[PDB]
Amino acid sequence: ATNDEEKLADIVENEIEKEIENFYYYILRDGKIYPASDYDIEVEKGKRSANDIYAFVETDVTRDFDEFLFDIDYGLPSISDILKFYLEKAGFRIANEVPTPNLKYYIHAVVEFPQYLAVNIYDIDSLARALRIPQIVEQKLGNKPRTITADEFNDIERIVAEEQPILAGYTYDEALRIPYHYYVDHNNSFKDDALKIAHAYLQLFPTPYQVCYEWKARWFNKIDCLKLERL
Amino acid sequence: IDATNDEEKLADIVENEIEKEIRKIENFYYYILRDGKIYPASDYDIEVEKGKRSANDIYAFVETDVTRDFDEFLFDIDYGLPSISDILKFYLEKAGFRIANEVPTPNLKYYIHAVVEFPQYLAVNIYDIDSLARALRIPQIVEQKLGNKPRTITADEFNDIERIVAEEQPILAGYTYDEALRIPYHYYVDHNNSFKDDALKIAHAYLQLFPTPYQVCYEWKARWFNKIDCLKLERLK
């Protein structure tokens, strides 16, 4: 499992390196990487298959070191993406969505300006469980695979993002608002609550397979992530 | 009245600054002072912390978003509302409340959202903070939870109010505020057509109930911004 994740991080890193503009990518089961937008056009043309998508890559670019560290350590994935990814992997189909049923990984790549790259690899199922998605989908839709309406997607989305406490008694939307307030907006009044959320997040949410690199002489050079966090 | 004159002045202040920045993507947040001077917010906060500048002089807060996708640019123009956190903070402080040990901005009248499309276009959206807070039912929720007498509130009290405003009350076509942000994003930015009916319902309620921002648009043409009709803008690729 860790072997596949190391391979995926080098696939992401080589692509960012090659590029050094683009933010979203798909990694296929064969290890090929493509920008997500152009792949979606090929999928609908019938040229490429959505069944071949193995990993989804979201690239954030930063110029502030506090933001870079926050993104890599405490940054939450989009709840809309994980819900969509979980539903499709469980056999459901969302109206107007081409499903990606064999998606295993969610990858968040953060580039600090170039100076550093941090590649975070998450298992989608593990992430969906921590977001308390399976139980809500089961209570609301059942187990029988079907196409769900936009209204049904929205009803589930509301519960998971706004109604269910996930971290230190807070909902997903409060857990986006409160930490960022302290960590990125540098507002000290939200220290107590941000730290409570941070502490719960680190234990309850799946630890990502994290690979770090430093930009030196036209290359990204693999380094210990602790060195990045310690600088 | 003179509100429209002030808003036109504010949009040219923002435009002049984005233009100045392009000719030399550096700063995303700014303050506009009551004298019309514009400063990056991060630097200004340090000058306040030093006793050089006063948070009392802040008249408008500017948030600049930069985009490279036309659909996202149009969505940000049409639905680029200020952060709930910001409007609540701005309303509380303007009403005399103090949030824990944080430095208040009591004389803030406007929230400005500037969107730059890559450079090709600039759209400046000016929101009146009071009008926005009222449409969000912020005064009624603050009154029910804190009372009418201003005092210092805890971070927990701020959070409790924020949760009701954004995640509990049906504010637009029966949806909570957070659903009202997500549904049109799903329709316009995620390009999912099944979300059309709900997005249009929210759009209709939003255009009726919420205050219309004063919107000013510009096209980048030969090292300068040049005025353009905003509705002409939505036709451009």
Swiss-Prot record, chain A:
Keywords of the record: Virion
Superkingdom of source: Viruses
Main location: virion
UniProt GO cellular component terms: virion component
InterPro entries, sorted: ATV_ORF273 (IPR048934)
Keyword Iron found: no
Subcellular localization, as worded in the UniProt entry: Virion
Protein name: Structural protein ORF273
Source organism of the structure: Acidianus two-tailed virus (ATV)
Lineage, uppermost ranks: Viruses, Viruses incertae sedis, Bicaudaviridae, Bicaudavirus
